[PDB]
Amino acid sequence: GWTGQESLSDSDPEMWELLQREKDRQCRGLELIASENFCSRAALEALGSCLNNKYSEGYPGKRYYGGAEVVDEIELLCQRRALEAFDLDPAQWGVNVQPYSGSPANLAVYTALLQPHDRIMGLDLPDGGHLTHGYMSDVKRISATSIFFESMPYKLNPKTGLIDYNQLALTARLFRPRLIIAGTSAYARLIDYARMREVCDEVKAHLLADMAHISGLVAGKVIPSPFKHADIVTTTTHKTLRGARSGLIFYRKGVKAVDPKTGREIPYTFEDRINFAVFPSLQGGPHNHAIAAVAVALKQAATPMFREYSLQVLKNARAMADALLERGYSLVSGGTDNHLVLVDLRPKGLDGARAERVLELVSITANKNTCPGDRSAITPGGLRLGAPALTSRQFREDDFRRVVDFIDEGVNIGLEVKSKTAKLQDFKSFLLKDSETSQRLANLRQRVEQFARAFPMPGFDEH
Amino acid sequence: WTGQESLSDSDPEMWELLQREKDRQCRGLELIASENFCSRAALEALGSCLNNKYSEGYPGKRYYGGAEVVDEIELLCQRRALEAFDLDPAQWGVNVQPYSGSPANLAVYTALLQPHDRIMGLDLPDGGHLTHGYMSDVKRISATSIFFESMPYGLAPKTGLIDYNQLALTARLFRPRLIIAGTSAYARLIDYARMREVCDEVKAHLLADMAHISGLVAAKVIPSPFKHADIVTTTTHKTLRGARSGLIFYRKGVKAVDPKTGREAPYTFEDRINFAVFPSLQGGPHNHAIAAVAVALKQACTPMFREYSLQVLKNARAMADALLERGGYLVSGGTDNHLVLVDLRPKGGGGARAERVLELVSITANKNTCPGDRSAITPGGLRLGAPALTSRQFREDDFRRVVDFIDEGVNIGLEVKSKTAKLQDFKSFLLKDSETSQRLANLRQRVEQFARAFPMPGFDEH
Ligand SMILES: CC1(C)[C@@H](OC(=O)CCC(=O)O)CC[C@@]2(C)[C@@H]1CC[C@]1(C)[C@@H]2C(=O)C=C2[C@@H]3C[C@@](C)(C(=O)O)CC[C@]3(C)CC[C@]21C
Numbered sequence: 001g002w003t004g005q006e007s008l009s010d011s012d013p014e015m016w017e018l019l020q021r022e023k024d025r026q027c028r029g030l031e032l033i034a035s036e037n038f039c040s041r042a043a044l045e046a047l048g049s050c051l052n053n054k055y056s057e058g059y060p061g062k063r064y065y066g067g068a069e070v071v072d073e074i075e076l077l078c079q080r081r082a083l084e085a086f087d088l089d090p091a092q093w094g095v096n097v098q099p100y101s102g103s104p105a106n107l108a109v110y111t112a113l114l115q116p117h118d119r120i121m122g123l124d125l126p127d128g129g130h131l132t133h134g135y136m137s138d139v140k141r142i143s144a145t146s147i148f149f150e151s152m153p154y155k156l157n158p159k160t161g162l163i164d165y166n167q168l169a170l171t172a173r174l175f176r177p178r179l180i181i182a183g184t185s186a187y188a189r190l191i192d193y194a195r196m197r198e199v200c201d202e203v204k205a206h207l208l209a210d211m212a213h214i215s216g217l218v219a220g221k222v223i224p225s226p227f228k229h230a231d232i233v234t235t236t237t238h239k240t241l242r243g244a245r246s247g248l249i250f251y252r253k254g255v256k257a258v259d260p261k262t263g264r265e266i267p268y269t270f271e272d273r274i275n276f277a278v279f280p281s282l283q284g285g286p287h288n289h290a291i292a293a294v295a296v297a298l299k300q301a302a303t304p305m306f307r308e309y310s311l312q313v314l315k316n317a318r319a320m321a322d323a324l325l326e327r328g329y330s331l332v333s334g335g336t337d338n339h340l341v342l343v344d345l346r347p348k349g350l351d352g353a354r355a356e357r358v359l360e361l362v363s364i365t366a367n368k369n370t371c372p373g374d375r376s377a378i379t380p381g382g383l384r385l386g387a388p389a390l391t392s393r394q395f396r397e398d399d400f401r402r403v404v405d406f407i408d409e410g411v412n413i414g415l416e417v418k419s420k421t422a423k424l425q426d427f428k429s430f431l432l433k434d435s436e437t438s439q440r441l442a443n444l445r446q447r448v449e450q451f452a453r454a455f456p457m458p459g460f461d462e463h
Numbered sequence: 464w465t466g467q468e469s470l471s472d473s474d475p476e477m478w479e480l481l482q483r484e485k486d487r488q489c490r491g492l493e494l495i496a497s498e499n500f501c502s503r504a505a506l507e508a509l510g511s512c513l514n515n516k517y518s519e520g521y522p523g524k525r526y527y528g529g530a531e532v533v534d535e536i537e538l539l540c541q542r543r544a545l546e547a548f549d550l551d552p553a554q555w556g557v558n559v560q561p562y563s564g565s566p567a568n569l570a571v572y573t574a575l576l577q578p579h580d581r582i583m584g585l586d587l588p589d590g591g592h593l594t595h596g597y598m599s600d601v602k603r604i605s606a607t608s609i610f611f612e613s614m615p616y617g618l619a620p621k622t623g624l625i626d627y628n629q630l631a632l633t634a635r636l637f638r639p640r641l642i643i644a645g646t647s648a649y650a651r652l653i654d655y656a657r658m659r660e661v662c663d664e665v666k667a668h669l670l671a672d673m674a675h676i677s678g679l680v681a682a683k684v685i686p687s688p689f690k691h692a693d694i695v696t697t698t699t700h701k702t703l704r705g706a707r708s709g710l711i712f713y714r715k716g717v718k719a720v721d722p723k724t725g726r727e728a729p730y731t732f733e734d735r736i737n738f739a740v741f742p743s744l745q746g747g748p749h750n751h752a753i754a755a756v757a758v759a760l761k762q763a764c765t766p767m768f769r770e771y772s773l774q775v776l777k778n779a780r781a782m783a784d785a786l787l788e789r790g791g792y793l794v795s796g797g798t799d800n801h802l803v804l805v806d807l808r809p810k811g812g813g814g815a816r817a818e819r820v821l822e823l824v825s826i827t828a829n830k831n832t833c834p835g836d837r838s839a840i841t842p843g844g845l846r847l848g849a850p851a852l853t854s855r856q857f858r859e860d861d862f863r864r865v866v867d868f869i870d871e872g873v874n875i876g877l878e879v880k881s882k883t884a885k886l887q888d889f890k891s892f893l894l895k896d897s898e899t900s901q902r903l904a905n906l907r908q909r910v911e912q913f914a915r916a917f918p919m920p921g922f923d924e925h
């Protein structure tokens with residue numbers, strides 16, 4: 001008779017088989033999705049805890065709901081570990097740990113700082129921006145950021161460091177936006193630019209750094225911090241931070257600067273505004289399980305171990321980069337200085353959508369990527385590859401050297417099938433039905449999986 | 464570093480806190496209609512490798528590879544949801560991605576309205592929850608009141624019951640595009656068939672946020688909004704006893720035709736609601752939450768859980784009866800659902816004194832505005848629910864001692880309230896006075912050991 005202390009294995013075999021298939025697919029796969037990581041077991045033990053059951057609407061100091069005695073201390077702990085993880089000064093920075101995920105963390109900042117229809121700029125979606133930074137199609141508002149607010153994108157300058165900081169400054173003086181976002185998905189270069197904070201300081205905009213993709217790197221000081229230049233920072237606690245899926249908003253606090261007469265030094269106004277956008281306005285009850293798992297990860301990230309990881313992540317990225325040039329690929333202007341690598345595949349003779357589907361069938365998971373020349377729409381000429389997921393499975397430069405030989409056999413199987421096919425589902429069908437290709441893919445799949453299965457995997461053994 | 468080390472080993476500080484929260488839960492009595500203790504099965508999924516998987520999109524329409532397995536978990540959760548409530552796949556869909564309750568609501572508004580379009584959500588004191596629409600007399604509070612234009616409630620004051628009259632009058636005036644049949648603190652059924660007239664009148668949309676009653680409806684004990692409503696939202700916690708997540712149910716397929724028009728006239732909810740959740744508001748789904756949600760929906764699609772929902776109402780009824788024979792007055796006269804809103808006005812006790820006393824006694828219920836009320840920091844009534852304790856196998860008898868335990872709370876309160884000045888001066892006197900602090904510790908021990916023996920869902924030690 002139902003106790004609810006039963007195991008998932010006993011009460012829901014259907015779900016336990018599926019957890020187990022997912023676990024096998026991760027262990028046997030080569031995961032190159034720049035935004036994927038494998039979460040620590042420690043973190044998942046918190047994530048899947050009794051903190052699920054506690055409603056704690058409000059914030060630590062006094063948050064009136066009730067018993068929150070212990071969760072208050074978890075939230076403060078998470079706060080302290082957050083500010084420790086990236087460089088201290090609690091005198092000069094605050095943090096909100098309650099955002100449900102990344103998109104909520106951004107919509108919170110917009111909501112706290114701007115009025116509906118206020119003007120926002122971010123790197124356009126195709127040029128490697130996030131959806132939540134704003135995106136309108138020809139005839140549709142697509143991001144909620146573009147619906148509740150007025151978004152104009154700053155494009156990428158095809159071949160250079162790409163982020164046209166020029167065209168930005170030109171258009172940000174014509175558009176008079178009250179917040180500009182500095183953050184990217186598909187970009188191999190450094191930003192979180194002190195020059196964003198000039199373009200901003202100029203036209204009286206707020207600088208928001210969305211560092212979700214590089215947060216681990218920043219956490220580790222293996223790349224330079226947006227927290228010197230930017231006044232608001234948002235991140236996810238997964239990706240390069242390697243925690244559970246949650247979000248963070250960091251904001252400046254205390255006295256901003258001093259000005260005419262004896263002074264009366266002007267105070268920052270973010271803290272209370274961002275905390276009101278998060279709890280009363282947008283979110284109900286925080287997910288205390290996520291907050292705890294986030295706390296576990298942030299401590300992991302404030303350690304010798306995590307600095308070694310993030311250095312290995314850059315060297316692994318460079319390795320995979322150097323390796324692809326060696327066989328003459330083309331990387332979106334140059335190479336990389338971060339966690340990922342954008343391959344241009346038009347000069348090697350294949351698009352992204354074919355390359356992605358071929359690698360998919362050999363247990364290599366990357367994403368197709370629009371290259372500056374946005375024909376776009378599921379047939380872009382690039383491929384986005386990242387090192388963090390595998391670097392967490394103890395891969396080194398030789399391991400990525402070999403990952404790239406497997407991608408090579410993939411690209412090469414593609415070209416071949418691209419020479420007997422009618423572009424669309426006549427390609428995708430041909431990979432299923434053709435006895436010669438179906439076999440050549442199985443053989444490559446089996447080599448990847450044997451290669452993949454041998455490396456350790458964070459998490460539990462079986463789920 | 465492997466990332467396979469146990470949390471005990473790698474973070475004792477966090478492991479101690481998980482463990483103190485575990486102590487705290489199994490210890491006390493939880494009567495908050497919005498709270499419940501999650502199954503081990505469900506938590507096993509919540510804390511799985513599904514946390515590791517990005518699957519932006521919907522099953523079949525993904526933007527990444529390597530979703531073969533997550534597709535099936537999402538569809539399973541879909542199916543378990545339509546089955547859980549009973550619901551014909553021809554005539555209903557579900558979206559299982561919402562991160563929580565507030566997102567599920569904002570997603571419906573975003574899919575169905577333009578910014579500044581008009582929303583009638585039962586006001587905060589008359590039922591409530593922020594996400595229905597709430598401005599103070601100085602400022603917009605809920606983001607629903609910022610991005611959309613919200614006009615409050617319609618209840619016959621004192622008479623807890625829903626003014627189906629002045630609503631219909633004002634829904635003919637204010638001309639709102641969507642009305643929210645749903646409640647935080649309301650012990651009665653919402654006439655959904657009469658909402659569907661008020662709404663079919665105004666050419667409005669009917670939304671039910673059935674967060675606290677979600678279990679009951681699947682369980683077929685209460686009448687489902689899913690006969691009258693077009694859109695239904697819920698959290699997967701509370702009454703459903705699952706992980707913190709959110710669901711959005713919506714009608715699909717044909718809506719009948721006029722004689723000559725032929726027969727073409729299909730629902731347009733699905734694509735719009737799904738597009739408001741993925742490109743529009745949310746990034747990647749929390750596949751771990753979806754999995755955990757799926758566990759709970761089955762745990763619940765079953766014989767076992769129809770006798771949870773049957774015991775929940777009768778547990779509620781029992782509590783209701785045993786406060787009419789003592790505790791105070793019954794805002795509504797009684798209950799017909801998972802909770803009772805007792806008035807402490809005719810008992811001469813605020814809602815905020817009575818809440819904070821039971822807190823120090825490890826019983827957590829809710830402060831609740833009642834129609835005879837002042838709007839200051841404290842004043843109102845008391846909101847009780849059967850889902851939490853009903854989960855630790857409590858029956859009607861459990862719910863006579865729990866009520867006698869609350870009586871000792873009410874009664875040490877009244878005593879405190881006759882030797883103290885304001886609330887500030889009241890809640891001081893509970894902490895300071897050696898005579899009262901010991902009288903309270905002795906009641907805390909009686910409720911503690913009444914529950915602490917009882918079984919609780921979860922991992923024993925987190
Ligand atoms: C008077 C005001 C309008 C005002 O008062 C200020 O805060 C002034 C501060 C300032 O000057 O900035 C602004 C917000 C607020 C303080 C109150 C309204 C009532 C609460 C208290 C407001 C709040 O924030 C949070 C909630 C929550 C909603 C609830 C019941 C749920 O929805 O479940 C969960 C519990 C909780 C906390 C109680 C009820 C309200 C709606």
Ligand SMILES: CC1(C)[C@@H](OC(=O)CCC(=O)O)CC[C@@]2(C)[C@@H]1CC[C@]1(C)[C@@H]2C(=O)C=C2[C@@H]3C[C@@](C)(C(=O)O)CC[C@]3(C)CC[C@]21C
Nearest residue numbers: 035125130131137142185186367368369377378519526742
């Ligand atoms: C408008 C939509 C939502 C929609 O397309 C349309 O509706 C167009 C209108 C029409 O069809 O007419 C669906 C397909 C899509 C083309 C675009 C924009 C969103 C991207 C581009 C979609 C896509 O395929 C792949 C991703 C990826 C996710 C991301 C950011 C990551 O997760 O890191 C990695 C980079 C990348 C490429 C950026 C953003 C999206 C989600």
